[PDB]
Amino acid sequence: HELSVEQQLYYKEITEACVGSCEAKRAEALQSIATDPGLYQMLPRFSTFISEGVRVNVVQNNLALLIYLMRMVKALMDNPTLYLEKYVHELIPAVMTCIVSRQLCLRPDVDNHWALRDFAARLVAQICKHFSTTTNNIQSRITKTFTKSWVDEKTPWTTRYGSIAGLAELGHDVIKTLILPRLQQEGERIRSVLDGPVLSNIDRIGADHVQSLLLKHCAPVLAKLRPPPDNQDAYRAEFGSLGPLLCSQVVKARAQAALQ
């Protein structure tokens, strides 16, 4: 029940290597976590450490330590020997907190909370690809939280960015049946982009980040369920920009076919 001194020392060295003194010891610690055979009996300690550390972001909005904890989770997932089925109920809300929380930064304007968003969204798509079973209902319960965070108004542009990022990393049919009904919401976004009374606020960078993610992920969905011509699909689309992105996506698909 209490870790032996060997694994107590291993736990201490591995956790203090992922706090940020140098990068090389961090990379060797993550390559230890990902590729060791006997790290069970230390999995509950790592899950507690990660979940409490993501909770400690509310007292200190440290983006860097959250990126380090998300790379710790991503290293824990790549271990073939240890099975995270009994401890996934702790790691799911930690990655969810890294996705849909609103202040991920200390200085909101310059910190790229945006990457800890798409990295943790890719992480939660992997955590509900490997572990979702019909007894679990992991993926349906993750889509429902993302959906009622996205459809509901009053949500900040950061948490809407996180919701759209996770929903769009889940797959193609999810963005068919969740993202595409609310494409008219882009008009409500472009209400505050092409014409804002306050330009120097922080809503504009988050809004056009949301816009760029939306049209990047909805370009292959428009390439899947439309004609090959796409003459004025952009005009038929909202703001006429999503349609230009869809034309660019069709061009990219043609280039990929030529490469094949």
């Binding site: 001194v5 060997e6 060295e13 060797e28 610690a29 060791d36």
Partner: protein
């Protein structure tokens, strides 16, 4: 509606094997991590991947780390 439980492994042989192999694996992982993130020696020429040795560092007072017990 009578409940069932999971199969319990109360065997002394496999419990000794599990505790032994987990202790050996965690001490191997610890020593390879500490030899990779520090100064290293090698019995063979340019041998860091296989059998890495943590390099010998001198102490300023060696009797304190030798004679003193650490678990008490």
């Amino acid at each position: 509606k009578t409940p069932t439980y999971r199969e319990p492994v109360s065997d002394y042989q496999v419990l000794r094997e599990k505790a032994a192999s987990q202790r050996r694996d965690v001490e191997r992982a610890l020593t390879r991590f500490m030899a990779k993130t520090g100064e290293t020696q090698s019995l063979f020429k340019d041998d860091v991947s296989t059998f890495p040795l943590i390099a010998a560092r001198p102490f300023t007072i060696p009797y304190l780390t030798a004679l003193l017990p650490s678990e008490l």
